[PDB]
Design a protein around this ligand. Structure first.
Ligand SMILES: [Zn+2]
Length: 37
RNA sequence: GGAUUGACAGAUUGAGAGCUCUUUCUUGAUUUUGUGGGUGGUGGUGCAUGGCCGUUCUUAGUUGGUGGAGUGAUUUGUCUG
């Protein structure tokens, strides 16, 4: 499967990642969990 | 394969205000917009009004009960010192 899973410690590695310019944004939370890669 | 709804990177504003936008994940089923239909307004209405306050006012005023006077208003009591 494409559309990357995340390393979310509040989830079971299933939340998708909003790919931006230098951002896989976790939308599960409001603002936090902005792991930059 | 999207009601409400949140944001970082940045023009953004006064903001380290995601509010709008490049954004794209999900926090999400709870009426998100019109009609019904509240609630608020420190909005006009104390000239529509509750209480309360002030003034008429430290000058003392007020009145039923039987009786008199008139016919009825009204008086007499409540007035000459
Ligand atoms: Zn994350």
């Amino acid at each position: 499967k494409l559309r990357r899973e995340c390393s979310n410690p509040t989830c079971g590695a299933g939340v998708f990642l909003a790919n931006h310019k230098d951002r896989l944004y976790c939308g599960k939370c409001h603002s936090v969990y902005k792991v930059n890669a």
